[PDB]
Design a protein around this nucleic acid. Structure first.
Ligand SMILES: Nc1ncnc2c1ncn2[C@@H]1O[C@H](COP(=O)(O)OP(=O)(O)O)[C@@H](O)[C@H]1O
Ligand code: BEF
Ligand SMILES: [Mg+2]
Ligand SMILES: [Mg+2]
Ligand SMILES: [Mg+2]
Ligand SMILES: [Mg+2]
Ligand SMILES: [Mg+2]
Ligand SMILES: [Mg+2]
Length: 438
RNA sequence: UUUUUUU
């Protein structure tokens, strides 16, 4: 029932180009700019329009309450993706930002969202959000909403999370009383738009987080329905650690004259702070191998572990076998009630439960303090998924370890895996090589 | 049963 709106732009009006270089940035010579990017491994796709990178938080002219939250976090320097992404976002250009897992992409798009909103007329009664952020999972949308909440406690900005499995009442109430920032999964937002609980008439700033996942074949049509409701002169910002060829052309259906920035290797790459370990075994030894791994992991104080499996059924079965065998393990997947999913992820965040067993519902975006191990019990569907899964550890500056159970049935992915491992200068299991050569 | 994504 949702039809592509054709906006008549001749009526409304809104503010776009408000970024002004800080004096420490204005005085940067081209040499100094190239050295900044080179040192931070920032690449601006050749021929694109792009401001200079900043190298300090005060360069972005965030409001003071934002800075106070940054100082409460004791964040001392913006990450590479923030150094180049803050100014580009704040300048108003459509963009694609590609940077390794745990590199701070969330703030890279949330804080310019706040400045953006601050240069707009205030919301009136009945107005929809100015900034819309779209994410592939309910937990990820809730996490991003809590970030936006920490940086808006001392301002007039309100945000809300719009996602399924949760009661509609409080979400509808948030929407009708008015929020500047809306974080959403696609289904529940489509539902609310069709029934008129919210609308996208004031939406001028649109973020696709985990953008390559949102453009895959199951999400693309939902993304298209939502984005057909947004004025075509909106600013569009796509973010991910992975940007495979197959999505690139498609992304341009939702972008105008955009700029792409990459941090790190232009090819597919994991975060280099993860120790990557690959075990070649048969399917049938996976159970035994896991137990031995866990017995090692659980002999140390810092033991927080995510275990990834391919299906909801194996998620349940492995979890039950671990807990009957007796381990302190809990699971999260798409057939759990949303109350159970929230309870399990909160227990895992807070250190009450050291072992999470998950499907790919937990593979993207989740930022959980002190995850020290990631275990691919089942190899994932793609190299990209591999990179995101193991990026659940070694966030920000921390280190972490990834163990992968690789079987002859995974053989057609071995090559691509080897390429990720070599790109991260890892010691390659000779058994993996020898499996490929035969 | 890939996995997610409004009852
Ligand atoms: N400038 C910074 N300095 C230190 N830590 C930061 C900075 N920006 C963000 N972080 C922290 O890094 C962690 C991962 O950031 P996040 O946006 O989730 O990464 P990504 O989206 O790039 O995977 C978060 O806990 C976040 O608070
Ligand atoms: F890329 Be981060 F892990 F969302
Ligand atoms: Mg400081
Ligand atoms: Mg954050
Ligand atoms: Mg401002
Ligand atoms: Mg086998
Ligand atoms: Mg993220
Ligand atoms: Mg759905």
């Amino acid at each position: 029932l949702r039809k592509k709106k054709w906006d008549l732009s001749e009526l409304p009006k809104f503010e776009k180009n408000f970024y002004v270089e800080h004096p420490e940035v204005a005085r940067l010579t081209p040499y100094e700019v190239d050295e900044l990017r080179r040192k931070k491994e920032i690449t601006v796709r050749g021929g694109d329009v792009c401001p200079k990178p900043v190298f300090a938080f005060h360069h972005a002219n965030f409001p003071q309450y934002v800075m106070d939250v940054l100082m409460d976090q004791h964040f001392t320097e913006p990450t590479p993706i923030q150094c180049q992404g803050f100014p580009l976002a704040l300048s108003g250009r459509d963009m694609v930002g590609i940077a390794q897992t745990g590199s701070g992409k969330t703030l890279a798009y949330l804080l310019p969202a706040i400045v953006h909103i601050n240069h707009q007329p205030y919301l009136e009664r009945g107005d929809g959000p100015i900034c819309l952020v779209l994410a592939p999972t309910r937990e990820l949308a809730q996490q991003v909403q809590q970030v936006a909440d920490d940086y808006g406690k001392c301002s007039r900005l309100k945000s809300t999370c719009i996602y399924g499995g949760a009661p509609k009442g409080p979400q509808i109430r948030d929407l009708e009383r008015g929020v500047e920032i809306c974080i959403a999964t696609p289904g529940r937002l489509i539902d609310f738009l069709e029934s008129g609980k919210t609308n996208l008439r004031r939406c001028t700033y649109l973020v696709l987080d985990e953008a390559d996942r949102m453009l895959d074949m199951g999400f693309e049509p939902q993304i298209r329905k939502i984005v057909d409701q947004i004025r075509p002169d909106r600013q569009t910002l796509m973010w991910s650690a992975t940007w495979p060829k197959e999505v690139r052309q498609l992304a341009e259906d939702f972008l105008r004259d955009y700029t792409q920035i990459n941090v790190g290797n232009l090819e597919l790459s994991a975060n280099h702070n993860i120790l990557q370990i690959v075990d070649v075994c048969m399917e049938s030894e996976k159970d035994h191998k896991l137990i031995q791994l866990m017995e090692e992991i659980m002999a140390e104080k810092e033991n927080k572990t995510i275990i990834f499996v391919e299906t909801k059924r194996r998620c349940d079965d492995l979890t039950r076998r671990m807990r009957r065998d007796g381990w302190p393990a809990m699971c999260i997947h798409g057939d759990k009630s949303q109350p159970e999913r929230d309870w399990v992820l909160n227990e895992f965040r807070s250190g009450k439960a050291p072992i999470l067993i998950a499907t790919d519902v937990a593979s993207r975006g989740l930022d959980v303090e002190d995850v020290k191990f990631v275990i691919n019990y089942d190899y994932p569907n793609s190299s990209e998924d591999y990179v995101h899964r193991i990026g659940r550890t070694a966030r920000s500056t921390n280190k972490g370890t990834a163990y992968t159970f690789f079987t002859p049935g995974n053989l057609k992915q071995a090559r691509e895996l080897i390429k990720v491992l070599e790109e991260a200068n890892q010691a390659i299991n000779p058994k993996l090589m020898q499996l490929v050569d035969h």
